[PDB]
Design a protein around this nucleic acid. Structure first.
Lengths: 106, 52
RNA sequence: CCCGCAGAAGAAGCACCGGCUAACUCCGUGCCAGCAGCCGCGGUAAUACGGAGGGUGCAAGCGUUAAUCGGAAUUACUGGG
RNA sequence: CGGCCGCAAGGUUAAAACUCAAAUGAAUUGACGGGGGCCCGCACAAGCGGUGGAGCAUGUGGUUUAAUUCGAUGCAACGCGAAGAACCUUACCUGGUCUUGACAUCCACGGAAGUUUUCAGAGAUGAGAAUGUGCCUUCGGGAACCGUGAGACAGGUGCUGC
RNA sequence: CCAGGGCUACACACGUGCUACAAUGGCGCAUACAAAGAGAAGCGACCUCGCGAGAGCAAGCGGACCUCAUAAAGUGCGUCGUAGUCCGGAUUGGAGUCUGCAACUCGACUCCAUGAAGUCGGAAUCGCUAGUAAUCGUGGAUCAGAAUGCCACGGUGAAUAC
RNA sequence: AGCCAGGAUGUUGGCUUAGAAGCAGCCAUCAUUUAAAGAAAGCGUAAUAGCUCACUGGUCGAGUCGGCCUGCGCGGAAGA
RNA sequence: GCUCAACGGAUAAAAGGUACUCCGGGGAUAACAGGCUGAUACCGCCCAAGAGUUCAUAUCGACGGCGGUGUUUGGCACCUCGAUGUCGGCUCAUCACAUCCUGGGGCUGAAGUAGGUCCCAAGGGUAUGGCUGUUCGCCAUUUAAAGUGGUACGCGAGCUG
RNA sequence: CGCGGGGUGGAGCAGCCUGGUAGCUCGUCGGGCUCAUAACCCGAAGGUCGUCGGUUCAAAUCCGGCCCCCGCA
RNA sequence: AGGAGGUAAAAAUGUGAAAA
């Protein structure tokens, strides 16, 4: 809801609803300007103190969930071959035949 | 780095005993929880996270 | 050891304060920072966390840690099942 | 672990490091049992009429939104608070304004109060042209009434039913 | 403090109601039979105009008397004759009345036209043993205006309980 | 073309305010006094001073200077 | 007309292995070596931003180009299939220079010293072992240096298998 | 730079071969069941079939170009 | 009193903080 106010579209990525209720692990894709830069600071673990209905004796039990933010952008490996290496070794290796041959293999 | 999931990092405490939100990293206290749950997150970055 | 002058002048901190174990309130932070020998408190209205005042115990000592014994009739001959 | 025994499987003898401040026995009062006996009730059995299927009425969630106030939210919330939302109500939003204030007391001041009514204006308000010029007088003013300077406060449908 | 707006927003689901899917019924004419209540900046004769909601004059009563108020089902007879039909009725265009500063978001009601869903409801589930179920009608509070919501009464009136 | 001198007044030129003075860094690419000097390539270059080529006269004063069409040659051309 | 997998159709009925192999032939046709070539490999030059503190001509050097040697792998079948009969090690060598050292010099971002880079030069010297069937290669310890190649990938009518 | 299998609800397989006419399982939505969930039961939307073209009263279908993956070389 | 015959397929699960 905060991202919509920032114009960012929150593209769903992964989710897994619990057997009874609630989601276990969820990740989404926020797309926009200053999305990561403004969220790079929000890699915290929030603390929740709420009245628990699941506990028959409705008492305030704490609850925890971590907010992890990563850029997700990825540009990688192209070519790393350089001329400062490659000691090219070309040596032979014998073989087999029928009478007197040295079937070599460089 | 994100291993601390349980009772390790209490960045933003959201209570319902008195309905008060406290980001201890600075101390930006707000008694308007529901709006924070729907938009009042902008204030956390600009004020609290301004200095870091 | 005794005699003369001298400005109260040169000479007071340590531990604890929920119960066990004598003795309290307020404020700050809110299962966070911390306390402890033990039972257990701190989860926004804390006699236990920290500071301030006050008070209790001791007193040039006061706490802490380690160690032996009694408490322990939980090695029982005395004195157990 | 070692010793011993055994064909083997293992048996026999027998510790510690470490961890917690409990483990355990009998019994008591409730609770609970696809335990039992008895009993009660539209529980089911025997019938009758509905809901869910349809159009619309109304509430909530969800979604949306400047707000679409907030609370109730298994049985025992959901035609509930609301014995009734076009303004009002309304606790909501936006805009425009007043801010010892809208309600109220004390210190100090001028003026009967009120009213016909005009301009700007969405309104709240500001600034006027005049009539009227009253109960009584410690007569340098006690009092229903309007506004004002300012120090105490007022108000709160703001939160907390743990 | 105030105008306007929202609380009635809408790709969705659920709770709670009114009327039917027809012929024990609809339409038409004549027509008998109730209890309890409310009334004054109120209810309103009689009468007059009209298709209608209502407009106007306006006695009586601040009340067992006057008014609201013609009870509706049902009964005699005629028509329709088993259809998505003359059963049913939302939606929709246009023309009006009521209260109110104001009916556009956003009211109730009326007139003309239009006229679908629906042909007795799956898994499943709810209420009731008495003048109760089911079913038709009326008044009041709430209220400036306006409910099928709520409260209350009357008409008709079963089966089963081994 | 060698040689002997000149090669400058504001300009310590803006500067993105302790800064690069023709010269790591981007610019208008000045008005002048003149037989005379482009606010610009290299050297120490953080910045200097200073040494040069453009440019101006005196001497040597005849063919000279910059290119083109072509012939023959040099370097490039190092292994059992 | 079934009918000719190869479609002028060995009768329209038909797959493999052979490293004891054997016989007849071929360098008409392969493997090692030599030969022509030089794609590739190797080495040497040209243009030249950039990197490097400033500056490319201290060095390296992209973008592409121009040649050489005949040591890698290959291309083509010229020589040998009435035999050129073997990879490495051992012993013994010999030549080239594009030099691993030692010598003589130029340049520097060569202070000193130690290095880097380039030119001249073949005179002489250019390790011992662990592991592998080894060349190569890795490691250990040195050394002034433990050079790069040719010589049937030198050398088996000299040895080993 | 050869021959071949395939691209079908979100996922995974028939349906094609012999030209019309896509079934089922899981998942999704909701209801009911218990206080809640699972399970169970009922009802239902959701796939013209990677992409382009020809043929036909009609092509995901018969066939071919382009892209991704896989088998042997 | 003395004592026999007929008489239940399937139904799992619920993290964690309060008592002067």
């Amino acid at each position: 809801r905060w991202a919509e106010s920032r114009g960012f579209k929150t593209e769903i990525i992964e989710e897994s609803e619990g057997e009874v209720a609630g989601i276990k692990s969820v990740t989404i894709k926020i797309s926009g300007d200053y999305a990561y830069g403004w969220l790079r600071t929000e890699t915290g673990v929030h603390r929740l103190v709420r009245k628990s209905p699941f506990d028959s004796g409705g008492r305030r039990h704490t609850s925890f969930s971590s907010a992890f933010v990563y850029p997700e952008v990825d540009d990688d490996i192209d070519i790393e071959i350089n001329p400062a290496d490659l000691r090219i070794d070309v040596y032979r290796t014998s073989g087999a035949g029928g009478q007197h041959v040295n079937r070599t293999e460089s | 780095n994100k291993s601390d999931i349980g009772w390790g990092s209490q960045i933003r405490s959201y209570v319902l005993d008195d309905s008060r939100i406290k980001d201890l990293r600075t101390g930006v206290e707000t008694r308007n929880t529901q709006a924070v749950l729907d938009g009042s997150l902008d204030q956390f970055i600009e004020a609290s996270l301004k200095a870091g």
